[PDB]
Symmetry: C2
């Protein structure tokens, strides 16, 4: 298990080490063959190397089997040239490894339906993985422009772009509850019709995974009224962007959310939360999202699904047993990591 | 007050007459000068006239100041040519009057936060009007196509298209709580940048209305976590379509929702619910949405805002006082219309 660890800025070092402590504890118990090295990234790397993704980190990422990424960014670096800003290093990491599917799970862990914006009965059991196509769609479409008179943009998709994001959805669904919902606008748009029929063709290779299709505006309604009905959801880029953010508010504790970017090169696993510099070094940062990023690494980079499930349960019980400050408790980073390891043992 | 009344199919006759009884009661009390005529539309008109929008109804719509529209459609007509289906008559009515903004309010009436998918604290006081551009955007954009290889569609908008939907938003906000949120994707898309800056320019004519801007994916999050923060929301067509449907589930009793289509010609006010043929003639159809359509007619077709507010309060108290079957009560159509008129008197 070869992991390049890029902790970043602010709370990145604290929460990334918490995740590594869970990984070393499972390595000792299971003989995972964990091997990792820490590389400079983000603002720390701008300060030491003059750029956020220096060639050493490029090489270590390049030579690794997975990247455990912390959080990047800070005021210091906000006024820099676009070329070297923390935010850009993140797009360079993605581009260097041709990562084309962003995976975001939103889950209401047992006993925390209280944090949901939704009523307890609706929030209970929510666990959905939004898979969003990353590289195409209207954000990158040609033609595009603006004049005094008008502005135009093109939602374009080729058979390959749709095929590759659909396969990670199917493969992802196999490791969870075997249900895929692909979301489109096929009843009005050609791109939607095309998406639908390419995913239906792709679906034929995955007989052990159920596939249904929904329109985006209906799916938005569903995600508030009955989100627990879904397992994996896959769609294009801007709808993926809308629907991941919709699903992200359902646990109602955004600090908790992990993310993965999967592709041709080395897969990247990171917390959704930012670098929260204001509390760096205080030992209060909630490690839940970094620990669940490590569990997405085990599931998605190494296929150790049953261990990811085991990490997830450990985190679920620690959230109940010693809630961090964000869940109204007092458990600082280390105290919370400890009760995860206690459940993991 | 000249109203063309197009009751349609299924429950359309029952719920439209309930709305007319509220209008005749306010006419007697206030001397509104109500004048109306009932015209054939939808399936009833296909059966009597051979087409869903026959020239008499075209003329009466044409000569009226507002259309009180019921619900249209039924199995009988589903296998007809597209040319004459109920659903198409609705697009012909819209087109004939060049209606370009669809207005959908989602409101949690006091005491019914219980029906919301959201927790009581979040659902309390929600009242937001989504204004959606109807005539343009990607659903109608050129170029568009599909091949074996790819599919493409164009989200295009001209300065006029944006200007006219922004003005009804501003004008709408003036009659409610004076706050507009325009929603775009201006941080990635040219169409978004263009939209934003045309609405900011338009906004200058409305100094008594506050304007802010939000990205669609952030606005989706907001609509679940703090929807009560908004008054009027305006956006393009597909995002309008996504965001109206998101906002529509927040009261959690879709039967209750009214709609208005506003434009150059005669404005159309209708319930959101369909023709529900299965209970036509039973006298159980909930008239709330048709009665609140009549209140949107008073506010938007005739500017009698204070009377619309007065109708709305009457309906709010009747929902509490004699809940219809959908809110777990026993009040049939007539019984519910009666306690609205009791509060209206």
């Amino acid at each position: 298990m070869k992991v390049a660890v890029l902790p970043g800025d602010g709370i990145g070092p604290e929460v990334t080490e918490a995740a590594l402590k869970v990984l070393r504890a499972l390595d000792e118990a299971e003989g995972l063959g964990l091997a990792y090295e820490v590389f400079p990234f983000g603002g720390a790397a701008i300060d030491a190397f003059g750029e956020p993704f220096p060639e050493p980190t490029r090489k270590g990422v390049e030579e690794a089997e997975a990247v455990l990424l912390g959080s990047v960014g800070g005021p210091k670096w906000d006024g820099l040239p676009r070329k070297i800003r923390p935010e850009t290093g993140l797009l360079s990491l993605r581009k260097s490894q041709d990562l084309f599917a962003n995976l975001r799970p939103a889950k209401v862990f047992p006993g925390l339906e209280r944090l949901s914006p939704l009523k307890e009965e609706i929030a209970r059991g929510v666990d959905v993985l939004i898979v969003r196509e990353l590289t195409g769609g209207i954000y990158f479409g040609e033609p595009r422009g603006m004049s005094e008179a008008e502005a135009w943009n093109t939602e374009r998709y080729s058979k390959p772009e749709v095929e590759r994001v659909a396969r990670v959805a199917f493969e992802a669904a196999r490791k969870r509850r075997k249900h895929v919902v692909s979301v489109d606008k096929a009843n009005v748009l050609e791109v939607g019709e095309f998406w639908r029929k390419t995913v239906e063709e792709v679906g034929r290779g995955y007989p052990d995974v159920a596939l249904e299709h929904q329109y985006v505006d209906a799916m938005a309604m569903h995600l508030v009224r009955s989100p627990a009905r879904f397992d994996v959801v896959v769609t294009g880029n801007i709808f993926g962007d809308i629907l991941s953010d919709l699903a992200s508010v359902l646990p109602g504790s955004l600090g908790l959310l992990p993310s993965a970017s999967l592709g041709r090169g080395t897969p990247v696993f990171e917390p959704v939360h930012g670098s929260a510099p204001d509390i760096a070094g205080k030992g209060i940062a909630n490690p839940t999202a970094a620990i669940l990023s490590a569990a997405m690494m085990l599931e998605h980079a190494f296929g150790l699904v049953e261990l990811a499930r085991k990490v997830e349960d450990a985190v679920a019980k620690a959230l109940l047993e010693t809630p961090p400050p964000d869940l109204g408790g007092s458990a600082g980073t280390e105290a919370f990591t400890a009760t995860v390891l206690r459940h993991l043992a």
